[PDB]
């Protein structure tokens, strides 16, 4: 299968350069040229340029100054580079690969690399539990508390638990530091027999924490 | 609408 | 650059039915117009290409059509699955350029929430901040009152909401209203209550609990 993966998301100070590598599989960089797009509040989305099967590269105008895309045939990576970033690069950033070499109906799309332009320092999260206690349902979840920048993931045990998960989008406080809720509803009765761990991975800071919860 | 980079929606 | 006016912003239509959305083009383009669709904390999907043919594995209750200026996708019979955004791509011109997007958004029947309310965790406490976690779970639609009261005390300003995305099965909300208290001033009081307010219940719906029991 056709596949391209882009490196974690994080933190860019003002005025320093962007970097990230797309890596593909399932086809070879000698054959299709690799577009990048973002996504940003202000602009939506926006096509920044290309790096052709032979090497050659376009850049979108307004990035002709501050752009440089390069790859590595032999190992499959496109590398992006933007350098001096405002506030108004805070965008997803996604590379791209289109139906057929030439062209520009882009099938195949990279996860995203959400990047935030701040000059913040990164900070991991807390985890704590939103403990069980209406007709067998029980709702339970966990707090995701103070840390920056976006984005975090949440899944429950270790991706097996998907039914009836809600992980609420994250909300700025007034510390300037971002926090959610993840929750799920369950019977009451397993919460006898099942345990329930939420995965919290922070990558920014490289804060990986599972919180086990139960009842109090 | 503005796109919202946290959901990937727009939100309006 | 070619510019790309979608409309309207926003469409909300019931299921099974049917939904065009347009695409207008500052000039003529031919048909080299590309449709997309993105869920929620999704990457664009593409849907169309050249204003009118498929792409492999996209459902056939997708389709466009149009040529020059006036482009339409259209969803003969949407489902709850097809709650997204959707966006349209020109490359006529260089550089291709984007429209701003329409969102879809799916009518269901009126469903009341379900309410829980979370007491902060000793743990958290230990931090010396406390977080009262209000949840209202699947209803519709999306309008909601949360109304937190301490000790009789009507609480504004300390809280703060967040709220999901329609759900992509049963078209559900769901909420999360946040109070964030001082661990001090958290135990010098007693009764914690969260009153819910929604189209769907005929009477607010209060969720408390006594610090301690």
């Known amino acids: 299968q056709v596949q391209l993966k882009q490196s974690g998301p994080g933190l860019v100070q003002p005025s320093q350069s962007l970097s990230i590598t797309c890596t593909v599989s399932g086809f070879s960089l000698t054959n299709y040229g690799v577009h990048w797009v973002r996504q940003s509040p202000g602009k939506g989305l926006e096509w920044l340029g290309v790096i052709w099967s032979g090497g050659n590269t376009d850049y979108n105008t307004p990035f002709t100054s501050r752009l440089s895309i390069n790859k590595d045939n032999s190992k499959s990576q496109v590398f992006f580079k933007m350098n001096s970033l405002q506030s108004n690069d805070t965008a997803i950033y996604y590379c791209?690969?289109?139906?057929?070499?030439?062209?520009?109906?882009?099938?195949?799309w990279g996860q995203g690399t959400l990047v935030t332009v701040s000059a913040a320092s990164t900070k991991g999260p807390s985890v704590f539990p939103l403990a069980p206690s209406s007709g067998g349902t029980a709702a339970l979840g966990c707090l995701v508390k103070d840390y920056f920048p976006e984005p975090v993931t949440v899944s429950w045990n270790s991706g097996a638990l998907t039914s009836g998960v809600h992980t609420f989008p994250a909300v700025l406080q007034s510390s300037g530091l971002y926090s959610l809720s993840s929750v799920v509803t369950v019977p009451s009765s397993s919460l006898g027999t099942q345990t329930y761990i939420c995965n919290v991975n922070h990558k920014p800071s490289n804060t990986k924490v599972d919180k086990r919860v139960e009842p109090k | 609408c503005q796109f919202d980079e946290s959901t990937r929606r727009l939100k309006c | 650059d070619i510019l790309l006016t979608q409309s309207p912003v926003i469409l909300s239509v019931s299921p099974g039915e049917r939904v065009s959305f347009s695409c207008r083009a500052s000039?003529?383009?031919?048909?080299?117009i590309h449709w997309y669709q993105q869920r929620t904390n999704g990457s664009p999907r593409l849907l169309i290409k050249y204003a009118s043919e498929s792409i492999s594995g996209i459902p056939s209750r997708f389709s466009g059509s149009g040529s020059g200026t006036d482009f339409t996708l259209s969803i003969n019979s949407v489902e709850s699955e097809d709650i997204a955004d959707y966006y349209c791509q020109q490359n006529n011109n260089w550089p291709t350029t984007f429209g701003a997007g329409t969102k879809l958004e799916l009518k269901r029947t009126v469903a009341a929430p379900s309410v829980f309310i979370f007491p902060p965790s000793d743990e958290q406490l230990k931090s010396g901040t406390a977080s009262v976690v209000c949840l209202l779970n699947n209803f519709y639609p999306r309008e909601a009152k949360v109304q937190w009261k301490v000790d009789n005390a009507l609480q504004s300003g300390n809280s703060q909401e967040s709220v999901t995305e329609q759900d992509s099965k049963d078209s559900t909300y769901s909420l999360s209203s946040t109070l964030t208290l001082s661990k001090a001033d958290y135990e010098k009081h007693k009764v914690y209550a969260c009153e819910v307010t929604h189209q769907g219940l005929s009477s607010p719906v209060t969720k408390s609990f006594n610090r301690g029991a």
């Open positions: 791209a690969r289109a139906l057929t070499y030439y062209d520009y109906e882009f099938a195949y």
């Open positions: 000039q003529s383009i031919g048909t080299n």
